[PDB]
Design a protein around this nucleic acid. Structure first.
Ligand SMILES: [Mg+2]
Ligand SMILES: [Mg+2]
Ligand code: NA
Ligand code: NA
Ligand code: NA
Length: 1206
RNA sequence: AAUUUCUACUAAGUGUAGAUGGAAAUUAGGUGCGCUUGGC
DNA sequence: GCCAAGCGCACCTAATTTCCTAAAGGACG
DNA sequence: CGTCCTTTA
């Protein structure tokens, strides 16, 4: 037979972009320089972005006029049905209609206005925007695009999107109804649960400062009020209710979420918080919070820094004022110096005793002396402690051990902090002195920011320690000889708060960086397309000479200069492209044949018009197959009379009777409405056109076109050549919409790292036995960015006319059903491994297993191993430390992309080698360490058109016949748990499971009560010591425990076998010995057969807490250390059918292993097996019902699968 | 350490291997730090 | 030491939309 | 009436 892969070619179409360098040839550059086309094009890009901004001012005005005047009708019905918890399938459809009607309501409000049509035509530039604007300069900018408004076509599409009624991400209607109305209704539910919590005063504060006293806070949680929140102005008010704002004085006014969090933290509860609404499309309103003016120049920051933080500055004297205050502590009453309860006490507690909570513990101990252990008790103790407003230093002294003195320690600390400020000055006298001027800009001067930040840091650290000694403020007996002075020095120390923020907010800006700009050559529709009839209008074509391809651009004054070039019958010739496209027959045939021009020459019958004007062919409620054939016949005869087409594409249509619908005919026109060929044109004469500057010529270039290129080309190079290859029968088409850019040089060449000619360069690969390379030319780092570069972007279309049309998912289920031995590739996001791969066959035998932390490659017999796990971790640390240091933050997305491109390649190779399907975790780690989402996207992308560059283009899986084994990637939003060959399955207990028996830990073993522990110990069939094995044995029937019904075997004998890694820091624990130590601590005769009743007689709560913890470690099969690839073992407390305990460390040691080599490998293995279970589920089902099989294995089903396979 | 671009390279000497859907628009997320009020 | 709710500033990242056109139509000299 | 920009399906 064939493979399953073989059936997945020519399934659906997609577009890609091929990118190239464009290299000016001959006098092209000089002529561009003389005519000044690049300064023209660079300025146009600046002005173009300016007109878009002005256009947006109008659109936002138009959006607000409409939205401010809209009352949504379907509103109460929608909200009522949206909540109702017993929605039948009828009611779900009903709710869907009201959601549509609400979006239609908004969209019609926009599209209703007069001249809504005019918003996306030249009228808005030439007329409407000039009237709306006032500034004579802004007007002149808009007016400079008269005769160039075609250049805004795409921007106008971007703007129309905003007014779509569709449930689409860029639509205002979508943002109002699908997102903000959904969040608003969710908040109404939250408001009814949470309402009891807010006191009258808190509610009135928001009403007064947030609402202006014009509404009640309850208003914004009633349905009828949603209209208020359709505009940004309203959203901002709503979100202030939720989140509060910062006043002009800096006071943080609290919103509802703050009050919910405080209530939760006060009462140990978990009330839900409100979701804020998203922004309205195209708005930009000021924050309702006040933030002070920030510095703006390298000069001003240096001024503020030297002014306010020099030794003569006041801030400095307050520090010494405060050090003298503490140094003479004994001249002040320690009964009158107060540390406010809260974070100040936490700080002083750590500073003096080593931990934040020591003072609370000493206070709790004294409370216990009077009142002493219920939860009632601890909660009363907490409430009594939280009532205390502050602690005196004298009181603090009574908590100190006999040897420690509290007031001496405070002196010692403040001494240590002022010293550290001096240490930092010792490196900063240079930045301060009058002579100093700076070399590089602060945003790029690392050495000067580190001086500033280290001094700023040392002052902040002193400030926060000082703040602890303020107290509550209103204590009665507080020493004012200390506090009058303290408050004076502290209040000027606070000056550093605005300085610190303002300096940080400036110095951490990335410096500006210019972007490339589009070139138009004075054509508002430049290079829009390649049809020969349009060459004059677009003024751009493609030429070929030998292996080399060229972009040819006709100067505006010489639009016809190329057409006039005949073939040279003797000398050399360029091959000029001859390109014909009939684009989109479903729009192009109506367009011309029902036009004023054509209906003149050739009148359709009144019947044809009526069939078309009413849509009797569209395959809808009014579909009429006889009418569809009559219309097709009119197009056909119109086509024979339209020479521009019938001559270009000698059409060959099926007889009309054979068409089932109008698309059946349109697909024939579309498949034949495309031809590419070459004519000859005199090289001498074409080159003279470039000489005289009537033609501009660029070589279409990447490194594979170099005469020194001799290896496998890039895939994209192959795509580009195949566009013009005779063996390409339409699988890859050249598309319109090409664009040309100028990217100005961004590096200076004399500042690039150079490896000089004739001097040996070190090779970096340690496996490369050739330690050195010596070249006869210079090699420059990032050379390409040290010159101006043209780049050409060329869209292409792949499988424009697909023929293998079927539901991809269904075909996969059908092929698997009838496959004797299907291979699954299990892929797991592990703890110690970015990705882990295990391949299984149809019977679940492991065929390959390895980590993808490192990528292996081999070329010319040379191995290269790239440790990407290490590279990414290095990069994450550089980014983390740069954020904390105010230094440059390096990119990581390219490194993840480069890593994942290697992963994807390896998986495509596994898919092709083993004809295999792919099993993934159905996600429904820490964000910067994450890699899996990018890996999904790039893998799905590749499987939309999967090519092996090594294959012949025309072979299955070659560049003309790519495999399409995932559905066309529209969005993550629209994905199910199957995307062709990729199955997403529940990850539940795929890693934390014994692969050799299926045993899983279903016990709750976190310590709770002494009687709970008794119950837990009593539920085991027996506990005993096994002397012949030196093991403790725990016989259990799962049916005697809560939360158990998922397990299938039920009866297990757990043994204290082996070691475990305890985490808390980490330490190795030997179970049997730890048990023995525990029982011996308490005089338990653990040899006394069944020790169960003996264990329950213990009364010390510390026995049971220690016992439950040992039980936990025993059921902890997964044992790993953070930062250790090599300590990730899986060990079972259960014996298999032959008396053996599964230890992954047995398998990690062997080259090929029957069972998982570690816990992350175990995850990939069982993810794969959950898909094997689903393949077995397709087999039980009949073909016509295959797309109804639930591929998600239930928990109980998995425990039975995993415990029975073995 | 060269690139349409990216990642790893030097790969036998102006490059090697793999990947690469671009443009525009909208919007969201995350990290870090400061401040406010709180919890452990 | 860690953390929550909220505000602010700086930075980097990424999801989801649209187009990937020749020819009719017309404003303009 | 030719050319160049805009609008259409
Ligand atoms: Mg190559
Ligand atoms: Mg590099
Ligand atoms: Na796309
Ligand atoms: Na944001
Ligand atoms: Na943040």
């Amino acid at each position: 037979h064939m493979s399953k892969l073989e059936k997945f070619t020519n399934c659906y179409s997609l577009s890609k972009t091929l990118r190239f360098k464009a290299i000016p040839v001959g006098k092209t550059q000089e002529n561009i320089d003389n005519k000044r086309l690049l300064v023209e094009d660079e300025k146009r890009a600046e002005d173009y972005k300016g007109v878009k901004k002005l256009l947006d001012r109008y659109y936002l005005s138009f959006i607000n006029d409409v939205l401010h005047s809209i009352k949504l009708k379907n509103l109460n019905n929608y909200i009522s049905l949206f909540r109702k918890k017993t929605r039948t399938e009828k009611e779900n459809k009903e709710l869907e209609n009201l959601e549509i009607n609400l979006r239609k309501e908004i969209a019609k409000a926009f599209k209703g206005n007069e001249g809504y049509k005019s918003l996306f035509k030249k009228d808005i530039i030439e007329t409407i925007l000039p009237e709306f604007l006032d500034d004579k300069d802004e007007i002149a900018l808009v007016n400079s695009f008269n005769g160039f408004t075609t250049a805004f076509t795409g921007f106008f599409d971007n703007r129309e999107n905003m007014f779509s009624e569709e449930a689409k991400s860029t639509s205002i209607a979508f943002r109002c109804i699908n997102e903000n109305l959904t969040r608003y209704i969710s908040n109404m539910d939250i408001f009814e649960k949470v309402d009891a919590i807010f006191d009258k005063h808190e509610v009135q504060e928001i009403k007064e400062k947030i609402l202006n006293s014009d509404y009640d806070v309850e208003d914004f949680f009633e349905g009828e009020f949603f209209n208020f929140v359709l505009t940004q102005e309203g959203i901002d008010v709503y979100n202030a209710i939720i989140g509060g704002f910062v006043t002009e004085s800096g006071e943080k006014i609290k919103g509802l979420n703050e009050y919910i969090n405080l209530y939760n933290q006060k009462t140990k509860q978990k009330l839900p918080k409100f979701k804020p609404l998203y922004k309205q499309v195209l708005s930009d309103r000021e924050s309702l919070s006040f933030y002070g003016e920030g510095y703006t120049s390298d000069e001003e920051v240096l001024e503020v820094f030297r002014n306010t933080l020099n030794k003569n500055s006041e801030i400095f004297s307050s520090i010494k004022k405060l050090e003298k205050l503490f140094k003479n502590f004994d001249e002040y009453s320690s009964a009158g110096i107060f540390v406010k309860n809260g974070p100040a006490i936490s700080t002083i507690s750590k500073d003096i005793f080593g931990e934040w909570n020591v003072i609370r513990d000493k206070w709790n101990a004294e409370y216990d002396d009077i009142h002493l252990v219920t939860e009632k008790y601890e909660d009363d103790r907490r409430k009594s402690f939280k009532k205390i407003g502050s602690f005196s230093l004298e009181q603090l002294q009574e908590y100190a051990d006999a040897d420690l003195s509290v007031v001496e320690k405070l002196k010692e600390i403040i001494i240590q902090k002022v010293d550290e400020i001096y240490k930092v000055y010792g490196s900063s006298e240079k930045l301060f002195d009058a002579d100093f001027v700076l070399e590089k800009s602060l945003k790029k001067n690392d050495a000067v920011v580190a001086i500033m930040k280290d001094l700023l840091d040392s002052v902040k650290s002193f400030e926060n320690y000082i703040k602890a000694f303020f107290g509550e403020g209103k204590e009665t007996n507080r020493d004012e000889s200390f506090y009058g002075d303290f408050v004076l020095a502290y209040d000027i120390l606070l000056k550093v708060d605005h300085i610190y923020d303002a300096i940080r907010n400036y110095v951490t800006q990335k410096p500006y960086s210019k972007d490339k700009f589009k070139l138009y050559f004075q054509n508002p529709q430049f290079m829009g397309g390649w049809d020969k009839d349009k060459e004059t209008d677009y003024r751009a074509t493609i030429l070929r000479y030998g292996s080399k391809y060229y972009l040819a651009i006709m100067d505006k004054k010489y639009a016809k200069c190329l057409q006039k070039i005949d073939k040279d019958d003797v000398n050399g010739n360029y091959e000029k492209i001859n390109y014909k496209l009939l684009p989109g027959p479903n729009k192009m045939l109506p367009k011309v044949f029902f036009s004023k021009k054509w209906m003149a020459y050739y009148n359709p019958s009144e019947d044809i018009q009526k069939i078309y004007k009413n849509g009797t062919f569209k395959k809808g409620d009014m579909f009429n197959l006889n009418d569809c054939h009559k219309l097709i016949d009119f197009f056909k005869d119109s086509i024979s009379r339209y020479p521009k087409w019938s001559n270009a594409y000698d059409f060959n249509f099926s007889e009309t009777e054979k068409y089932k619908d109008i698309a059946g005919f349109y697909r024939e026109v579309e498949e034949q409405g495309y031809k590419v060929s070459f004519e000859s044109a005199s090289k001498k004469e074409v080159d003279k056109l470039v000489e005289e500057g009537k033609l501009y010529m660029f070589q279409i270039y990447n490194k594979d076109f170099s005469d020194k290129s001799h290896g496998t080309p890039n895939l994209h190079t192959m795509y580009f050549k195949l566009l013009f290859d005779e063996n390409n029968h339409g699988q890859i088409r050249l598309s319109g919409g090409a664009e040309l850019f100028m990217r100005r040089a961004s590096l200076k060449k004399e500042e690039l790292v150079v490896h000089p000619a004739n001097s040996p360069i070190a090779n970096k690969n340690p496996d490369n036995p050739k330690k050195t390379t010596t070249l006869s030319y210079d090699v420059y780092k990032d050379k390409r960015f040290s010159e101006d570069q043209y780049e050409l972007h060329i869209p292409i279309a792949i499988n424009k006319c697909p023929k293998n049309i079927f539901k991809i998912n269904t075909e996969v289920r059908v092929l698997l059903k009838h496959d004797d031995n299907p291979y699954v590739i299990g892929i797991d996001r592990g703890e110690r491994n970015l990705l882990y791969i295990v391949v299984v066959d149809g019977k679940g035998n492991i065929v390959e297993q390895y980590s993808l932390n490192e990528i292996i490659n081999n070329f010319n017999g040379i191995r290269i191993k790239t440790d990407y796990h290490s590279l990414l971790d290095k990069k994450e640390k550089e980014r983390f430390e740069a954020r904390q240091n105010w230094t440059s933050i390096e990119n990581i997305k390219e490194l993840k992309a480069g890593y994942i491109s290697q992963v994807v390649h390896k998986i495509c190779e596994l898919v092709e080698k083993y004809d295999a399907v792919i099993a993934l975790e159905d996600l429904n780690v820490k964000v910067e360490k994450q890699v899996y989402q990018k890996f999904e996207k790039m893998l799905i992308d590749k499987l939309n058109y999967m090519v092996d560059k090594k294959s012949n283009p025309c072979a299955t899986g070659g560049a003309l016949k790519g495999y399409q084994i995932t559905n066309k990637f529209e969005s993550f939003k629209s994905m199910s748990t199957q995307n062709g060959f990729i199955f997403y399955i529940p990850a539940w207990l795929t890693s934390k499971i014994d692969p050799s028996t299926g045993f899983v830990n279903l016990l709750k073993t976190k310590y709770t009560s002494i009687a709970d522990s008794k119950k837990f110990i009593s539920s085991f069939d027996r506990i005993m010591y096994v002397p012949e094995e030196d093991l403790f044995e725990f016989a259990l029937d799962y049916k005697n425990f809560s939360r158990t019904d998922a397990d299938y075997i039920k009866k297990w004998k757990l043994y204290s076998y082996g070691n475990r890694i305890r985490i808390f820091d980490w330490e190795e624990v030997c179970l049997t010995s730890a048990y023995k130590e525990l029982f011996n601590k308490y005089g338990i005769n653990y040899q006394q057969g069944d020790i169960r009743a003996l264990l329950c007689e213990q009364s010390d709560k510390a026995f049971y807490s220690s016992f439950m913890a040992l039980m936990s470690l025993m059921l902890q099969m997964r044992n790993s250390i953070t930062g250790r690839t090599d300590v990730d073992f899986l060990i079972s407390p259960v014996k298999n059918s032959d008396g053996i305990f599964y230890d992954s460390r047995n398998y990690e040691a062997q080259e090929n292993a029957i069972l998982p080599k570690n816990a992350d490998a175990n995850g990939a293995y069982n993810i794969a097996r959950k898909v094997l279970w689903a393949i077995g589920q397709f087999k039980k089902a009949e073909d016509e019902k295959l797309d109804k099989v639930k591929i998600a294995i239930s928990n109980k089903e998995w425990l039975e699968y995993a415990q029975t396979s073995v």
